[PDB]
Design a protein around this ligand. Structure first.
Ligand SMILES: Cc1cc2ncnn2cc1Nc1ncc2c(n1)n(C1CCOCC1)c(=O)n2C
Length: 819
């Protein structure tokens, strides 16, 4: 009774009813729901109540060289607040919050919480290892902390509880509303690799097409591997409809009986591997089927060259036969594992057996230091083997919480490549999310994003999210309810306003202010956590400061009062609500940008990127962080010029925005670093040729790219004469020499992680955006196979292309966006 009311709560939180069984041909999902109860109960039981409640955000990574330079006399200052009194305490970087709290007991148990944020400085960790402390030192900000009560862990309450050949009969296909011919193609797939293919006779394409044909395959029943798919496709030759059926179910049983599968239409892609059937029964095409059944010196040199190549380089049959024959020598190299597991003939019982016998000897793999890039390779579309994939998830177990946040989005997307709903990787995301509130918060949104707009993976993700939500605790369930109610309310307003020329009229601005006033006094909760920044609690809408922006898509500019009084400022929380752009694509790029920032940190570099907050909430809709004191490069050009570009404008803008020369000199240095940062990052990703309306800058000189939704004279990246003027070049300058030095050092630093970026990219396009040629872009961009000296000049040439193009490209972009 109250059990049923709790499920409706979950349904509203998830955005999908998990109990629904109208779109299933088996009990996989229900078996998975049941399956995940154990990992859920196991993690809820093993987590420390106190640390789970306070969620301390910490890193074990060494403090970078640039932050060591910002700390004088091995002393950090912390301002400790309480009601009206605040004192500054000299703290050593190695001091534990427990020891610092004893100093505010002798110098005249409570907890140290960051001012105006739900972020605590607790646990056996030196302050230098707290992310917020690192954040403050990075931006040159004073650490303000408040002395208050630790939150009650009671609030985190969890509610109690055979030699025959394989064959398939194709009965027929049928579409309600369609003189071309048509045929059905049947494939036995195991991780992209087609083991066996069979076709039907072409019949005239009508509203109902019957065959009653037994399609005998070459592959034997015994040779079928677990995780193999019966891919059914309809070609008219152009492909129109597809559907997948797992030949061996979640119970290790060979699939039998009658099946009526509603197929997916066509507009490679993770959506093409889905075991799910089309929920649209009334309009979709459906298919009716029936089932009822030691090594030489030279070869080592050749093998080592194979192992060394990038993850995209294809293996020839020659390469594969070499890798397999010398699998035991190959097993001694963890970097070889993806290529070795691609040399496996999975449609042969004896070979798979030998592969499993091989995996028993994982000495080198197990002992090796974790390589994320290598681990990620084994979780892509090329590996359907549960045991192969499990060895990767095993390596991920050793990632610290800080690192899980870096890879979380890609890891959630990587669930799409899993043959079965319950999987080691799904369980891993469940385990990590339940162990940490920050991981859990993002995990919620990431999964909620896919459920909202992916009919291909909503059922699988909805099972995982229900599993999370059933163990996250009342506290967080309350937080997610407040967030879901707010965003649902605001999405309605976003779409309503878009429905009402690029001119923002008086009648439109009034209608928005009218709707927001109506929500405020109605059912909008008093406060809510910011989905892209869970540390911040937003309160009431500042209607006066709210507006509709003069754009193509007409987004909402919303401003909130901070719910936390303990904030040392009366700053408002700015959020943009937008319909028209695919923000899942923006989310993926931003996640890659943060991975690049972490790669530069390893080499003690800070290229000052601004990977702003961005959450996808539904179909072509979501929210974006308003970056305070920032403007568009085009708006700076519009203020002096109008519609033509002047080089002196940018440097002039930074001068008038600077109070002192001391702050202006810092603004120039920040522009040099940030420009170099975006120049390298956008180039590698192939999203460099951009209009200056899509590039922003802060009043503090920080340059940043925005609007990554959907991406002749071309340019590697945007390096315009106005950017070069801030560096002091029309020639060369000590700033421009510093710029080229940063670029090369940054570009070469990313090339040291070629395999990682290639995998992240390969996966990003498969789950977020395309063709083989689109994926191979990054190989050329990262100059795979070239030496550092040769690669150093390559990027220096790319910079020289920008200088030789000038304003040409920018000007042509201006013409493009004005028809
Ligand atoms: C960070 C960010 C990324 C992004 N991607 C798409 N929209 N979007 C908005 C963002 N945030 C932001 N913060 C402050 C802004 C601002 N955008 N804009 C405009 C808004 C329309 O597009 C051009 C920029 C301003 O005039 N100010 C003062």
């Amino acid at each position: 009774e109250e059990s049923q009311a709790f499920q409706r709560q979950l349904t509203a939180l998830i955005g999908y009813d998990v109990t629904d069984v109208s779109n299933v041909h088996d009990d996989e999902l229900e078996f998975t729901r049941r399956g995940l109860v154990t990992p859920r109960m196991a993690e809820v039981a093993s987590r420390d109540p106190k640390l789970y409640a306070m969620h301390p955000w910490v890193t074990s990574k060494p403090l970078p060289e640039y932050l060591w330079k910002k700390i004088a006399n091995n002393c950090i200052f912390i301002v400790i607040h309480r009601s009206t009194t605040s004192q500054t305490i000299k703290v050593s970087p190695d001091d534990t919050p427990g020891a610092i709290l004893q100093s505010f007991f002798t110098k005249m148990d409570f907890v140290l919480r960051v001012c105006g944020r739900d972020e605590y400085l607790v646990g056996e960790t030196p302050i230098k290892n707290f992310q917020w402390v690192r954040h403050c030192l990075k931006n040159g900000e004073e650490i303000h902390v408040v002395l208050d009560t630790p939150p009650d862990p009671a609030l985190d309450e969890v509610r109690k509880e055979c030699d025959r050949k394989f064959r398939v009969k194709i009965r027929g296909i049928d579409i309600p509303v369609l003189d071309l011919t048509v045929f059905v193609e049947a494939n036995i797939q195991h991780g992209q690799q087609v083991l066996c293919q069979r076709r039907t006779s072409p019949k005239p394409f009508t509203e109902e097409v019957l065959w009653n044909v037994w399609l005998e395959f070459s592959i034997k029943i015994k040779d079928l591997p677990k995780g193999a798919l019966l891919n059914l496709q309809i070609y008219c030759v152009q492909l129109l409809y597809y559907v997948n059926l797992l030949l061996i179910d979640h119970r290790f049983l060979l699939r039998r009986g009658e099946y009526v599968l509603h197929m997916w239409q066509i507009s490679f892609n993770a959506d093409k591997l889905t075991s799910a059937t089309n929920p649209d029964k009334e309009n979709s095409m459906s298919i009716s089927i029936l089932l009822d059944n030691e090594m030489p010196n030279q070869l080592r040199k050749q093998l080592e060259a194979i192992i060394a190549t990038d993850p995209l380089n294809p293996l020839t049959a020659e390469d594969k036969e070499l890798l397999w024959h010398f699998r035991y020598e190959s097993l001694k190299h963890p970097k070889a594992y993806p290529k070795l597991f691609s040399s496996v003939k999975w449609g042969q019982q004896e070979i798979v057996a030998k592969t499993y016998q091989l995996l028993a000897r994982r000495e080198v793999w197990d002992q090796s230091a974790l390589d994320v890039g290598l681990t990620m390779q084994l979780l892509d579309c090329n590996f359907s083997d549960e045991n192969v994939r499990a060895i990767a998830v095993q390596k991920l177990e050793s990632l610290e919480d800080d690192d899980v946040l870096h890879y979380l989005l890609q890891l959630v997307q990587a669930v799409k490549f899993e043959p079965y709903h319950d999987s080691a990787l799904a369980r891993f995301l469940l385990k990590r999310g339940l162990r940490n509130k920050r991981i859990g918060h993002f995990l919620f949104w990431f999964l909620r994003s896919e459920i909202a707009q992916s009919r291909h993976y909503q059922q699988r993700f909805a099972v995982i999210l229900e599993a999370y939500l059933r163990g996250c605790g009342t506290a967080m369930l309350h937080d997610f309810t407040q967030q879901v109610q707010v965003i649902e309310m605001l999405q309605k307003v976003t779409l309503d306003i878009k429905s009402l020329k690029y001119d923002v009229s008086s009648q439109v601005i009034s209608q928005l202010k009218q709707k927001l006033e109506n929500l405020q006094n109605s059912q909008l909760p008093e406060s809510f956590r910011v989905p892209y920044d869970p540390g911040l609690k937003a309160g009431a809408l500042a209607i006066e400061k709210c507006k509709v922006m003069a754009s193509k898509k007409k987004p909402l500019w919303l401003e909130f009062k901070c719910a936390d009084p303990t904030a040392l400022s009366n700053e408002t929380i700015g959020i943009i609500f937008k319909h028209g752009d695919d923000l899942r694509q923006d989310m993926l790029i931003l996640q890659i940008l943060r991975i690049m920032e972490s790669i530069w940190e390893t080499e003690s570099l800070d290229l000052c990127l601004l990977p702003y907050g961005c959450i996808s909430t539904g179909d072509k809709i979501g929210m974006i962080e308003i970056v305070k004191d920032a403007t568009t490069i085009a708006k700076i050009q519009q203020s002096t010029v109008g519609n033509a570009f002047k080089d002196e404008v940018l440097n002039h803008w930074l001068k008038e925005k600077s109070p002192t020369e001391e702050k202006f000199q810092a603004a120039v240095e920040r522009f040099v670093y940030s420009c170099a940062g975006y120049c390298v990052a956008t180039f590698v990703l192939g999203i460099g040729d951009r209009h200056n309306d899509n590039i922003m800058i802060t009043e503090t000189g920080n340059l940043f790219h925005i609007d990554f939704g959907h991406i002749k004279e071309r340019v590697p990246f945007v390096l315009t004469p106005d950017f070069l003027f801030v560096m002091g070049t029309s020639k060369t300058s000590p700033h421009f020499q510093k710029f080229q030095d940063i670029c090369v050092k940054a570009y070469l630093a990313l090339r040291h992680h070629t395999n990682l970026l290639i995998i992240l990219f390969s996966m990003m396009l498969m789950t977020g955006m395309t063709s083989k040629e689109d994926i191979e872009y990054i190989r050329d961009a990262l100059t795979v196979g070239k030496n550092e000296e040769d690669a150093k000049k390559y990027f220096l040439d790319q910079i020289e292309v920008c200088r030789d193009k000038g304003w040409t490209v920018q000007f042509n972009w201006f013409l493009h966006l004005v028809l």
